[PDB]
Structures are given as structure tokens and as C-alpha cells.
Amino acid sequence: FPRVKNWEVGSITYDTLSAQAQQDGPCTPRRCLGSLVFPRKAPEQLLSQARDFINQYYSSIKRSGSQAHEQRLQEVEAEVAATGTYQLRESELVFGAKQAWRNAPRCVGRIQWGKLQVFDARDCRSAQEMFTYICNHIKYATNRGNLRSAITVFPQRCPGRGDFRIWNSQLVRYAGYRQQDGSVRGDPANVEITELCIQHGWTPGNGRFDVLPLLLQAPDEPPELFLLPPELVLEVPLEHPTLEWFAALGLRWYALPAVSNMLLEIGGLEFPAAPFSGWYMSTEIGTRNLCDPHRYNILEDVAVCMDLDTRTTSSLWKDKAAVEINVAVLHSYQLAKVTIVDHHAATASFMKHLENEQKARGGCPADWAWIVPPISGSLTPVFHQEMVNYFLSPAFRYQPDPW
Amino acid sequence: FPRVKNWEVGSITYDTLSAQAQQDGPCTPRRCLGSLVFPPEQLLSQARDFINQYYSSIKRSGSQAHEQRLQEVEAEVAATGTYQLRESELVFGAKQAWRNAPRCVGRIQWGKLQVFDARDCRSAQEMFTYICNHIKYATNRGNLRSAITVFPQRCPGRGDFRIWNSQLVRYAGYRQQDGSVRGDPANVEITELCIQHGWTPGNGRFDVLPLLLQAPDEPPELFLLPPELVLEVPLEHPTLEWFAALGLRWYALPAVSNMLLEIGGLEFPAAPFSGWYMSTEIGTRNLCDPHRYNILEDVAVCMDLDTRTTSSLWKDKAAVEINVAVLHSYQLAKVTIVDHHAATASFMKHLENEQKARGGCPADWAWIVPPISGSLTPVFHQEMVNYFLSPAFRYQPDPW
Ligand code: HEM
Ligand code: HEM
Ligand SMILES: N=C(Nc1cccc(CNCCc2ccc(-c3ccccc3)cc2CN)c1)c1cccs1
Ligand SMILES: N=C(Nc1cccc(CNCCc2ccc(-c3ccccc3)cc2CN)c1)c1cccs1
Ligand SMILES: C[C@H](O)[C@H](O)[C@H]1CNc2nc(N)[nH]c(=O)c2N1
Ligand SMILES: C[C@H](O)[C@H](O)[C@H]1CNc2nc(N)[nH]c(=O)c2N1
Ligand SMILES: [Ca+2]
Ligand SMILES: [Ca+2]
Ligand SMILES: [Cl-]
Ligand SMILES: [Cl-]
Numbered sequence: 001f002p003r004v005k006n007w008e009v010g011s012i013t014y015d016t017l018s019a020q021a022q023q024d025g026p027c028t029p030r031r032c033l034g035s036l037v038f039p040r041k042a043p044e045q046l047l048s049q050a051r052d053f054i055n056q057y058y059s060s061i062k063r064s065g066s067q068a069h070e071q072r073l074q075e076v077e078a079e080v081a082a083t084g085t086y087q088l089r090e091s092e093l094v095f096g097a098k099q100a101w102r103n104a105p106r107c108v109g110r111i112q113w114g115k116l117q118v119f120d121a122r123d124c125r126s127a128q129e130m131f132t133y134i135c136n137h138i139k140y141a142t143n144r145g146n147l148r149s150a151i152t153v154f155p156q157r158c159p160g161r162g163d164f165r166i167w168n169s170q171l172v173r174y175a176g177y178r179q180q181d182g183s184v185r186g187d188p189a190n191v192e193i194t195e196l197c198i199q200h201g202w203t204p205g206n207g208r209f210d211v212l213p214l215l216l217q218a219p220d221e222p223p224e225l226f227l228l229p230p231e232l233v234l235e236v237p238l239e240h241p242t243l244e245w246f247a248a249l250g251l252r253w254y255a256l257p258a259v260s261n262m263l264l265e266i267g268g269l270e271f272p273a274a275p276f277s278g279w280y281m282s283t284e285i286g287t288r289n290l291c292d293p294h295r296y297n298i299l300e301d302v303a304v305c306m307d308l309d310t311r312t313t314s315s316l317w318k319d320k321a322a323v324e325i326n327v328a329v330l331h332s333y334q335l336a337k338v339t340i341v342d343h344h345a346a347t348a349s350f351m352k353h354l355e356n357e358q359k360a361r362g363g364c365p366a367d368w369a370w371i372v373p374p375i376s377g378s379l380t381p382v383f384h385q386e387m388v389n390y391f392l393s394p395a396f397r398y399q400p401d402p403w
Numbered sequence: 404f405p406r407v408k409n410w411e412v413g414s415i416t417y418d419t420l421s422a423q424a425q426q427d428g429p430c431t432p433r434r435c436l437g438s439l440v441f442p443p444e445q446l447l448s449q450a451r452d453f454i455n456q457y458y459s460s461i462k463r464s465g466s467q468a469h470e471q472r473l474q475e476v477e478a479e480v481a482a483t484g485t486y487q488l489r490e491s492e493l494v495f496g497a498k499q500a501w502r503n504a505p506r507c508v509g510r511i512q513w514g515k516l517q518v519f520d521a522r523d524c525r526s527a528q529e530m531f532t533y534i535c536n537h538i539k540y541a542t543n544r545g546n547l548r549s550a551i552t553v554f555p556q557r558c559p560g561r562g563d564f565r566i567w568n569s570q571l572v573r574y575a576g577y578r579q580q581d582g583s584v585r586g587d588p589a590n591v592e593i594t595e596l597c598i599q600h601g602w603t604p605g606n607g608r609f610d611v612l613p614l615l616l617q618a619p620d621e622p623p624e625l626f627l628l629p630p631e632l633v634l635e636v637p638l639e640h641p642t643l644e645w646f647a648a649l650g651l652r653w654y655a656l657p658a659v660s661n662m663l664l665e666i667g668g669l670e671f672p673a674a675p676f677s678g679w680y681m682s683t684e685i686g687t688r689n690l691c692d693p694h695r696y697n698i699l700e701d702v703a704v705c706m707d708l709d710t711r712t713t714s715s716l717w718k719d720k721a722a723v724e725i726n727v728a729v730l731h732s733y734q735l736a737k738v739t740i741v742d743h744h745a746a747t748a749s750f751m752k753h754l755e756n757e758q759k760a761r762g763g764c765p766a767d768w769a770w771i772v773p774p775i776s777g778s779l780t781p782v783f784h785q786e787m788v789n790y791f792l793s794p795a796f797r798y799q800p801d802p803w
């Protein structure tokens with residue numbers, strides 16, 4: 001078992017959980033591909049995945065080997081033999097969604113993994129009904145700024161019928177209008193989905209923070225366009241506690257991060273539409289979304305307004321401007337009473353999570369490059385913690401864009 | 404051939420050089436261990452592989468001189484059990500081992516390296532002389548120059564040359580009855596060893612350690628570095644006048660002395676090399692790490708920051724100003740230093756050069772991305788492939 005060291009404390013653990021990893025990652029003894037973003041391109045193997053998951057469920061409730069456990073295994077075996085597939089019990093769906101979050105190697109927020117509201121939308125039958133489920137999710141999760149983690153699970157993939165899909169990468173996203181110069185107005189991350197919305201009849205704006213409509217796909221149907229009710233989309237105007245001109249930049253961000261394009265896998269069943277939401281870590285907005293060169297790219301503009309010397313790297317003007325942008329995000333969200341966590345508190349809670357999981361399961365899959373925040377890396381405890389990355393199921397997985 | 408993407412630009416390359424990865428790393432299809440710090444006819448086969456590398460690099464592949472060199476090493480190892488590198492082979496081997504080092508962000512410089520051949524060495528006193536000339540050459544009154552001194556290779560039946568110090572210049576670290584450390588906690592072990600082997604200690608936070616040099620099969624011997632050989636930089640801040648009163652300092656020359664150099668199956672356990680510092684090594688890791696000098700909260704108190712909530716980003720503001728102090732102080736003292744923005748930009752150019760030269764470049768993302776301002780540097784957005792090529796710099800157990 002791999003020996004794992006914390007270099008701040010000198011302490012040593014062994015990740016025995018990794019030995020149970022099912023699916024394979026991209027690394028070999030010859031070359032490590034741990035830094036790649038996308039590390040990746042029935043009845044018998046369905047059952048082995050289903051049996052393993054049922055075994056996980058009955059362990060979680062301290063009832064392994066019980067009569068109920070044996071009967072549920074036999075019951076899943078019979079449904080798979082008769083129909084080629086099976087259905088989760090309500091309780092198994094709730095457990096499986098929490099487990100998938102718990103298993104997600106790139107999530108620093110997993111201290112919260114047991115506090116997840118699971119909306120069962122498996123009886124959904126139309127794109128219009130999808131939209132109602134989505135609006136109820138956003139209302140519940142937003143909670144007028146007191147954010148609450150939630151996941152809505154639409155029907156599973158099954159033979160003879162198309163998938164439910166949410167085409168948008170997140171429930172709330174800003175338009176990115178590809179200008180003719182090859183530039184972008186708005187968020188360059190969303191140029192594709194923006195052009196698809198327009199092509200599907202959306203009348204576009206011309207702003208930098210235009211909320212996109214939803215493109216929702218019901219089985220064997222072209223996507224359908226739905227506009228979010230403005231009262232449902234909580235947004236935070238950005239201002240700085242001591243730089244009064246900062247508010248004149250006209251920056252904003254939205255309250256609720258709600259990823260809608262990943263696939264949820266539980267016991268071999270696949271849910272291609274299962275959007276989930278929590279709350280933001282402030283570096284996601286302040287450092288990546290606003291300062292990445294290929295996103296809003298505001299770093300130079302802020303530094304010039306701060307009267308920093310932008311003609312030499314050695315002044316550290318980039319570092320200084322980024323710090324103040326991160327202060328603005330945190331100040332602005334706290335002022336608006338919208339839940340947010342800074343990267344110091346988030347990584348401290350992740351260290352606690354590693355300690356809990358070492359005790360509970362003997363390890364924790366963790367992707368160091370994603371867990372370490374994009375600023376102030378070695379000023380947080382996770383930088384000094386060795387991590388082991390592997391794939392457990394249930395899981396959230398990437399999946400191709402449906403177009 | 405792994406497909407490698409830059410997410411800032413969208414450009415794609417393929418790493419065809421990872422196919423030649425000679426040794427085996429720690430990762431498997433089951434689990435990635437990329438974040439871990441420490442992951443006869445045998446000698447002849449590595450020796451042959453290196454010779455072909457060498458003659459390929461000078462466009463002499465397979466020809467007259469290539470065959471002659473292959474037969475010499477064969478007869479050498481038959482007679483003695485090892486073999487001697489030609490001086491040019493040794494220079495080529497040192498440079499390649501740097502070029503191949505996945506965790507080094509400074510490899511744009513790999514072709515410019517002064518190699519000091521100390522293979523004719525015996526006794527620690529001569530070791531000390533080679534090291535002192537290395538230090539004087541590399542320091543060069545603050546205009547730093549990259550250098551490596553190569554001491555005799557390990558061979559059977561004979562002991563080893565070792566430099567017990569992890570670096571040629573290190574500050575001592577002393578413990579007390581409250582368990583804490585005055586000085587550098589990283590050097591508590593070597594400091595008590597220097598104390599055992601003669602050295603009488605100081606009681607400062609920046610006492611330069613003596614050298615514990617080990618000649619084959621003798622005990623290590625205790626040598627003091629002449630103070631004018633050790634260039635140091637007192638740290639001040641361009642605008643925070645109280646920063647100087649903190650009394651912080653660092654030394655000019657980063658000279659790693661505890662890694663093993665491996666060339667063509669030969670192993671040199673004492674081969675100290677030096678370059679110059681990247682500012683974050685000093686201002687973020689050595690001064691701000693919690694298990695190092697750990698001065699971050701001291702600076703924040705001096706800056707009148709709000710230290711009772713993390714969301715004020717007092718740690719981040721204090722770290723930037725410490726890195727500003729480091730850069731300003733080295734530049735004012737006319738000592739070579741590179742900030743992490745310039746350094747990562749140059750590594751990007753290195754990646755492009757190596758793509759054309761060898762079809763790839765082994766790189767360890769966790770070590771190439773700086774410990775502050777990660778995503779503000781271009782390397783953060785660059786996917787990288789990590790693998791082991793030879794010649795190489797390798798970790799090795801401590802002598803004790
Ligand atoms: C409750 C507060 C939460 C916080 C602060 C948080 C934080 C984060 C952050 C910062 C990332 C990196 C994302 C990026 O850089 O683009 C991430 C990734 C991720 N999170 Fe969490 N998260 C939270 C809740 C959740 C919940 C409720 C779920 C699902 C039920 C979840 C599942 C995931 C997954 C699957 C990833 C990986 C995304 C990928 O691979 O691209 N997280 N999280
Ligand atoms: C000339 C300017 C140079 C710069 C700016 C530079 C920078 C760096 C940095 C920042 C690291 C990370 C080390 C750490 O975090 O402790 C590193 C590692 C390394 N460097 Fe360079 N370096 C330079 C020259 C050299 C030279 C001349 C050699 C050898 C001839 C070399 C070989 C290595 C090796 C082997 C490592 C990995 C060491 C380890 O794993 O601890 N570097 N370098
Ligand atoms: N707190 C949160 N956060 C979070 C969590 C998971 C995933 C994400 C979003 N992950 C985005 C990765 C990314 C980054 C940039 C670009 C991109 C940039 C420029 C152009 C094109 C694309 C694309 C992607 C997705 N591949 C956020 C939460 C959301 C939900 C619960 S918690
Ligand atoms: N510019 C440079 N830099 C650089 C490059 C390579 C290697 C290193 C040193 N790598 C440090 C590894 C390290 C540091 C601290 C501690 C430690 C800290 C606290 C307590 C105990 C130990 C342990 C280790 C290795 N285990 C620096 C150059 C040096 C030479 C040419 S360029
Ligand atoms: C190339 C590299 O893998 C890529 O930029 C990664 C690095 N670490 C990350 N970490 C997080 N949390 N989110 C990201 O999008 C990324 N991007
Ligand atoms: C746990 C982790 O591997 C360890 O802290 C590494 C991470 N990246 C690093 N990168 C550099 N340049 N130097 C280091 O010491 C480390 N430490
Ligand atoms: Ca049924
Ligand atoms: Ca006592
Ligand atoms: Cl986001
Ligand atoms: Cl150092």
C-alpha cells in the first residue's frame with residue numbers, strides 16, 4: 001500500500017483504499033499523466049458493479065450480510081436477468097449520490113459530503129417537466145443567499161430511448177459573444193453554448209454578464225430553449241472594501257455554481273442528467289474566472305487602476321492585483337449575504353476530511369493539482385500533503401457534449 | 404503517444420519522447436502517485452545506451468569513433484568492474500542530467516553549465532578545496548554562473564565520497580526544552596551532527612553551518628567555510644522601512660550537494676551543482692513554510708493586517724510583500740535572482756525548444772507551477788508528462 005506523507009507535520013499514512021480502485025486512470029509505470037484535464041477518451045459486468053454498490057449501501061447502514069442485504073442482491077440479480085437492467089431503491093439513490101460526491105478526487109469541498117439534498121426526478125417525462133425540476137432545484141439551493149447543497153437526478157439511461165441531457169455546462173452561465181475580431185464579449189468559456197442558444201432562437205444581448213437560457217433535451221427530441229426567471233438567479237455586484245473605483249468596473253458574478261453536464265454513475269447505472277450545486281470557493285471566481293488570460297482577463301486593467309508598475313514582472317503587479325480581486329469577491333459576497341468560502345478555510349476543512357476518511361475508509365482519492373488553490377498554493381495545508389489519485393464508484397464522470 | 408494540451412492557447416502537441424522512458428515511475432493504471440516527493444551485464448547495457456546518445460548528439464552515430472568507444476568500455480569493465488568517462492562524455496552527461504530533470508523550472512539554461520572534473524580527488528581536505536573553488540567560481544561577486552563539480556564515482560570494494568550537508572550553504576537549526584527551533588528547522592539533523600563532530604555552535608537564526616565532508620571509508624571531517632566565500636543578502640523592503648529590522652537574510656548561492664549523478668550506469672554520489680535562486684524558493688518556501696522559518700504571521704502583524712479571519716487574505720498579502728522584499732534585496736545587492744513570472748515564461752520557451760529537439764520534455768507539474776500565483780503563470784495551463792530519462796539526478800539515502 002502506498003505510503004503518504006504530510007510534510008508540514010511529518011506524519012505518515014497508508015492509502016489502503018486505492019487498492020480497491022475499479023476503473024483505470026491514465027498513468028503507467030513509464031509516464032504519469034496526472035496533470036491532464038481529461039484523462040480519458042452487458043449483464044455480467046452490470047451485475048458485478050451492482051453487487052458491489054449494494055454491498056457498499058448495506059455497509060454504510062451497518063447491516064452487511066443481513067437477510068435484507070442478501071434479498072436485495074437476489075432481487076437485483078432477478079431484475080437484471082429478466083430486463084437487462086434494474087432500478088435503484090430511493091434510499092440507494094440518495095446514498096449513491098452522496099458517495100459519488102465523496103469519491104470525487106478533484107473536489108476540495110467534500111467535508112460536506114453527507115449534507116446533500118437529493119431530489120428524485122426519475123419520473124420526469126418531458127423537457128417542460130425538466131425545467132420545473134430545475135427551477136425547484138435553483139430555488140431550494142439558492143435559499144436567498146444561504147446556499148444549500150443539492151442534486152436533482154433525472155431518469156437513467158436505458159436501451160431503446162434517448163438520454164435526458166442539459167446542454168449547458170452549468171445552470172447559470174454568462175453569455176460569450178464571439179466578436180468578429182476573434183475577441184469575445186462576455187465569458188469565453190461559453191462561446192459554444194452561446195451560439196447554440198442563438199441558433200435555437202434565443203434573442204441575444206450584448207453585455208458581459210448576460211445570463212444564458214437553458215437548452216434542455218428530453219429523450220429523442222431536439223433541445224428546447226427555456227429562460228430562467230430573473231427572480232431565481234441571484235447575482236452579486238463586485239465592489240472592493242477599500243478601492244472605491246473597483247465598483248465602477250461593473251463586475252458581477254452569480255451566487256449558485258450548479259454543474260449540469262457531468263454523468264452520475266451508481267451501481268453500473270448511468271444518469272446523464274443529474275445537475276448538482278453547492279457554493280463557491282472564492283478563488284474560482286476571483287482567480288480563474290476573472291483573471292485567467294482566456295477568461296475575463298481583467299488582471300492588467302485592475303493593476304493599472306491600482307497604479308502598479310506593469311512594465312516589469314519583478315514588481316509582482318500580477319500577484320498584487322489578483323489578491324485585491326480575491327478580496328473584492330469575498331467582501332462582495334459577504335456584503336450580499338451569499339455563502340462563499342475562501343481558499344484558506346476550504347483547504348483547512350479538506351485536511352479534516354482527509355483525517356475523517358483515513359479513519360472511515362483507510363484513504364481518500366485526491367487530485368493534488370486540483371485540490372491546491374490557484375493562488376497562494378504553499379500557504380495552504382493541502383500543498384504539503386501527499387495525495388493518491390484513483391477512481392472509485394459511484395462517481396461523477398465527464399461525458400461528451402451532446403452536439 | 405500522449406496528447407498534451409495548453410488550455411490558455413488551445414494548442415496540442417504529442418510527447419513522443421516519453422516512449423523512451425528508461426526507468427519506471429511510481430504510478431500505475433490503478434493509482435497516480437505523481438504528488439509524492441520520493442517516488443556485470445547490467446552496467447554494460449546502460450553504458451552502451453549512453454554512448455549511443457552521445458555520438459548521436461554530435462552527428463557521429465554508428466561511425467568509426469563510435470565503435471572504438473564501445474569496445475573500450477567493454478574491456479574496462481572486464482578488467483576493473485567499472486569504466487572511466489571521457490572528459491567530453493562527462494560534460495555531455497552532466498548537462499543531459501540537468502536537461503532531463505523533471506522538477507527543474509530553470510532548464511532553459513541547460514546548455515550553459517561549467518563542469519569541474521574532480522575525479523582525481525582523494526581526502527576530504529582536497530574535497531574542501533574543490534568545493535571552495537566551485538563556490539568562488541559560481542558566486543562570481545554575485546553574477547552567478549551555473550556549475551557542477553564531479554567527485555570520484557562509486558566503485559566496488561571502495562567506500563564513497565559524500566557531502567553530508569544537503570547544500571553547500573545552510574543555516575543551522577537549534578532545539579530547546581520547549582521543542583522549538585532557533586534557525587532553520589530543516590537543518591536540525593545536520594546541525595547536531597556538526598556539533599557532534601567538533602563544531603561549536605552559535606545561537607543565531609542564520610548561522611552558516613560548517614561542511615561535513617566524507618572521503619572513502621574515513622569518518623566525515625569538519626571544515627569551516629571562509630566567511631568571504633559565503634555571499635549573503637540582508638533582506639529589506641523597498642517601502643516598508645520596518646522590514647529590515649526583522650533581521651532576515653538569505654545566501655546568494657543555491658548549491659545542492661546531496662543528490663546522486665548517474666551517467667551511463669556510473670554513479671557519482673558527490674556531484675554538487677549550483678545555479679541561482681528563483682525568488683519564491685526563498686520568499687515563499689524557506690521563509691513562509693510552516694515547518695521552515697514560518698515568518699508569515701510576524702510580517703502580517705507588522706503590516707497591521709487583520710489576522711483573526713482568513714477571508715481578509717492576510718496570509719496572501721504578507722507573502723507578496725516578503726517576495727517583493729526578496730527580489731528588491733537581491734537586485735539591490737547585485738545578486739542574480741529570477742522571479743517566478745520570468746522563470747515560468749522561460750520554461751514555456753524551453754518546452755517549445757524541446758518539442759522540436761527531442762519530441763517532448765519530462766516535466767513534473769506540481770514542481771514547475773510556483774507555490775504562489777500558480778494560475779497567474781503560463782505553466783499552470785500547460786499539461787505535462789512526467790517520466791525518467793538517463794543521465795539523471797537522483798535522490799539517495801543519507802550517509803548516516
Ligand atoms: C458545498 C460546497 C462545495 C465546494 C466549496 C466545492 C468546491 C469545489 C471546487 C473548488 C472544485 C474545483 C472546480 C474547478 O476548479 O472547476 C470542485 C470540483 C468538483 N466538485 Fe465540489 N464543491 C462543493 C460541493 C460539491 C457538491 C455538492 C458536489 C456534488 C454533489 C460536488 C462535486 C464536485 C465534482 C464532481 C467536482 C469535479 C469537477 C471536475 O472534475 O471538473 N462538489 N468542487
Ligand atoms: C540556473 C538557474 C536555475 C534555476 C532558476 C533553477 C530552479 C529550480 C527550482 C525552482 C527547482 C525546484 C526545487 C525546489 O523546489 O526545492 C529546481 C529543481 C531542480 N534543479 Fe534547477 N534551477 C537552476 C539550475 C539548475 C542546475 C544548474 C542544475 C544541475 C546542473 C539543476 C538541477 C535541478 C534538479 C535535479 C532539480 C530537482 C531537485 C529535487 O528534486 O529536489 N538546476 N530548480
Ligand atoms: N464550487 C463549485 N465549483 C465547481 C465544481 C465542479 C466543477 C466546476 C466547473 N469546472 C470547470 C472546469 C473548466 C474550466 C475552464 C473551461 C474553459 C475555459 C475557457 C474556454 C473554454 C473552457 C472549461 C471547464 C470545463 N471543462 C465548478 C461547485 C459546483 C457545483 C457544486 S460545488
Ligand atoms: N535554485 C535552486 N533550487 C533548488 C534546486 C534543486 C533542489 C533544491 C533543494 N530541494 C529542496 C528539497 C528539500 C527542502 C527542504 C526540506 C526540509 C524542510 C523542512 C524540514 C526538513 C527538510 C527537505 C527537502 C528534501 N527532502 C533547490 C538550485 C540549486 C542548485 C542549482 S539551482
Ligand atoms: C493543465 C492543468 O491540469 C489545468 O490547468 C488544471 C490544473 N489545476 C486545476 N485545478 C482546479 N481546481 N481547476 C482547474 O480547472 C484546474 N486546471
Ligand atoms: C506533497 C508535495 O509533493 C510536496 O509538498 C511538493 C509539491 N511541489 C513542490 N514544488 C517545489 N518546487 N518544491 C517542493 O518542495 C514541492 N513540494
Ligand atoms: Ca421495479
Ligand atoms: Ca521543559
Ligand atoms: Cl465557475
Ligand atoms: Cl533553498
Ligand SMILES: [Gd]
Pocket residue numbers: 242243244
Ligand atoms: Gd480608498
Ligand SMILES: [Gd]
Pocket residue numbers: none
Ligand atoms: Gd505601528
Ligand SMILES: [Zn+2]
Pocket residue numbers: 027031032033034430434435436437
Ligand atoms: Zn501519475
